[PDB]
Amino acid sequence: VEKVFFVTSPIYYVNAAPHIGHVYSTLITDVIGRYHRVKGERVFALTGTDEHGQKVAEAAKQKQVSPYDFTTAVAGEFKKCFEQMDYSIDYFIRTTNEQHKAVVKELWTKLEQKGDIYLGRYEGWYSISDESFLTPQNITDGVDKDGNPCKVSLESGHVVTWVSEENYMFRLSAFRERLLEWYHANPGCIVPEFRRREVIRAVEKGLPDLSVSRARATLHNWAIPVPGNPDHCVYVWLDALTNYLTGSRLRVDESGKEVSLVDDFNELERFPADVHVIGKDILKFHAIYWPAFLLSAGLPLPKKIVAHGWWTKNVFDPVEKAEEFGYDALKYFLLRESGFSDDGDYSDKNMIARLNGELADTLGNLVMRCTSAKINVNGEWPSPAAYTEEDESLIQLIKDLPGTADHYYLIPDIQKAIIAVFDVLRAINAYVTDMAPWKLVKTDPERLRTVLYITLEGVRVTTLLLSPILPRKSVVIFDMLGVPEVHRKGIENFEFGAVPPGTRLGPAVEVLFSKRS
Ligand code: MET
């Protein structure tokens, strides 16, 4: 099925300002989207804001503004932050959007017509901050903001309260077997693998039914009303998860405003998501509830959910650090430092070590070497003479790299993709050191042509595969190398030899990444 590659971030609660968590999740979404564009595919990358619910209305109340003004202001802050971070997200969705509300109503009605929503009761614990129902085994003793004794969540440490309400209930318990079939038939559907095992164990234990409405007073009336029952409001998570469906059905103009909601998702060829990017805190909502809703509605299930090691929901301001160290460099660092865990060093010390060691010394040094007037005297891509075995060993690494990096990007595992590209960059550097092309200008011009050609081509291929990570710097490198625009994307240009000998380098001025103390 040739379709639009559909990648999403979570939609973030607007109770507080954009921080590194949100920026990280959206960065991952962006990188995946960029890689598929570089590959030549149609892409739709989605991000946005989750604006309804008790938690947002209470944050608005604290600031003494109306929820409408509060959500609009904070959404504006998220939008500004993502523009400054230089993402290439196709659409920014807000759950206050009238087209989103219509989709929530259609989905609700569909679930109700199937017999999967009934009127019942929830009596149990609830975390307002997580918008999450909890069994007594997921709570323990703790303290509130003040310090008085209370119950808290085992998941997040936030305060829990006992709720007793008549609620519309989704028959989640009826979907246990089908969810387990789905996990087993699609063993790459949740990444990384240990998070997939966690989900399976949880569903094997048994699933209760899920409350999907609340009484309107509890939510301070700041929510989507239930169709045909205005005393109730739709659970912020059914509302929130539905953004992915809404997003898949919006025609978007050249400036990013939604202009139209289509009736059938197949018309735009996005649904279901190829990758849902999430933090580990919302795994259950995405890997249990969401597919159960989709199964109930007869809608297709997402292909992959990737859950990263950070939380989604001592200051670290990403825009400040990016102004200090560079935007591409910060993005590189966030993606290189952590895989699917928290155990990872985010200090100025480590940022500088990676900036200096990998970006400046490995990549940047190598870009300057192969384009300098001292070594590349004609300022062009030379024609290679015959290859030695050592030449062939490096060429083989360069040729294998696109296949290797591609598999990593598709897992997705961006850290391993970066590591694989840099392994090849290190090998190119070792080769340049062995061949001493600076000596070869005088001693053996015929040999230098071969060495310089291989070096230029290794730099091109590595840079192409790093272009989703370093989108601006990749453009600078390609300009220095004189790579025509047509050769800067497309799977055809993953092949060794795509830029012919005779191609002129770009003009010189001059640093790519400047080292720090
Ligand atoms: C459908 S994704 C919703 C994510 C949620 N608003 C959060 O901040 O965790």
Mutation probe of ligand 1 site: the residue of 9, 11, 244 with most atoms within 8 A of C-beta: 11
CA distance 37 to 491: 10
Q: Take atom 9 of ligand 1 and give the residue whose Cα is closest.
A: 313
How many angstroms separate the alpha carbon of residue 262 from the centre of ligand 1? Answer: 24
Exposure b/e, 421-434, CB count within 10 A at least 16 = b: bbebbebbbebbee
How many angstroms separate the alpha carbon of residue 10 from the centre of ligand 1? Answer: 5
What is the position in ligand 1's atom list of the atom closest to the CA of 236? 6
How many angstroms separate the alpha carbon of residue 247 from the centre of ligand 1? Answer: 15
Cα–Cα–Cα angle for 166, 171, 174, rounded to 5 degrees? 155
How many angstroms separate the alpha carbon of residue 11 from the centre of ligand 1? Answer: 5
The angle, 0 to 180 degrees and rounded to 10, between the axes of the packed helices 414-435 and 389-410 is 170
CA distance 415 to 458: 20
Mutation probe of ligand 1 site: the residue of 153, 281, 282 with most atoms within 8 A of C-beta: 282
Tokens found for residue 488: 């800067």
Q: Take atom 1 of ligand 1 and give the residue whose Cα is closest.
A: 241
Tokens found for residue 313: 């929901």
Q: In the chain, helix, strand, coil percent, each to 5?
A: 50, 20, 30
What is the position in ligand 1's atom list of the atom closest to the CA of 244? 1
Mutation probe of ligand 1 site: the residue of 13, 156, 305 with most atoms within 8 A of C-beta: 13
Looking up tokens 């009605």 gives 109
Helix (H) / strand (E) containing 142: strand 139-143
Q: Take atom 5 of ligand 1 and give the residue whose Cα is closest.
A: 12
Q: Range(s) for CATH 2.170.220.10 in the chain?
A: 116-236
| Backbone phi, psi, residue 81, to 5° | -55, -45
Q: Range(s) for CATH 3.40.50.620 in the chain?
A: 1-115+237-346
Ligand 1 pocket, Cβ-based, cut-off 6 angstroms: 10-13, 50, 240-241, 243, 282, 312-313
Resolution (A): 2.3
Tokens found for residue 277: 């990017």
- 341: buried, middle or exposed (CB in 10 Å: 19+, 13-18, 0-12)? exposed
* Residue 216 near residue 230, CB atoms below 8 Å: yes
Helix, strand or coil, per DSSP, at residue 116: coil
How many angstroms separate the alpha carbon of residue 313 from the centre of ligand 1? Answer: 7
CA distance 509 to 5: 39
Looking at residue 259, its amino acid is V
504-511 contacts, C-beta under 8 A, 24 or more apart:
504/379, 504/380, 505/371, 505/376, 505/379, 505/380, 505/381, 505/480, 505/481, 506/479, 506/480, 506/481, 506/482, 508/371, 508/373, 508/480, 511/364
- Give me the architecture of the 347-517 domain, per CATH: Orthogonal Bundle (1.10)
Mutation probe of ligand 1 site: the residue of 7, 8, 9, 12 with most atoms within 8 A of C-beta: 12
The distance of Cα 205 from the centroid of its chain, to the nearest Å, equals 30
CA distance 84 to 153: 35
Helix (H) / strand (E) containing 22: helix 20-38
Look at strands 132-134 and 213-215 and give their pairing.
Answer: unpaired
CA distance 203 to 173: 9
CA distance 311 to 25: 9
| Distance set, CA 150 to CA 52, 140, 153, 386 (Å) | 26, 9, 10, 76
How many angstroms separate the alpha carbon of residue 241 from the centre of ligand 1? Answer: 8
* Residue 74 near residue 208, CB atoms below 8 Å: no
- Give me the architecture of the 1-115+237-346 domain, per CATH: 3-Layer(aba) Sandwich (3.40)
| Distance set, CA 451 to CA 33, 233, 430, 444 (Å) | 35, 68, 12, 11
* Residue 445 near residue 300, CB atoms below 8 Å: no
Tokens found for residue 64: 């003494």
Cis amide prior to 272 (ω within 30 degrees)? yes
| Backbone phi, psi, residue 215, to 5° | -60, 140
Tokens found for residue 68: 């409408």
| Backbone phi, psi, residue 150, to 5° | -155, 180
Look at strands 229-234 and 225-226 and give their pairing.
Answer: antiparallel
What spatial distance separates the first Cα and last Cα of the chain, rounded to whole Å? 51
Exposure b/e, 442-454, CB count within 10 A at least 16 = b: eeeeebbbbbbbb
- Give me the architecture of the 116-236 domain, per CATH: Beta Complex (2.170)
How many angstroms separate the alpha carbon of residue 481 from the centre of ligand 1? Answer: 43
CA distance 10 to 241: 9
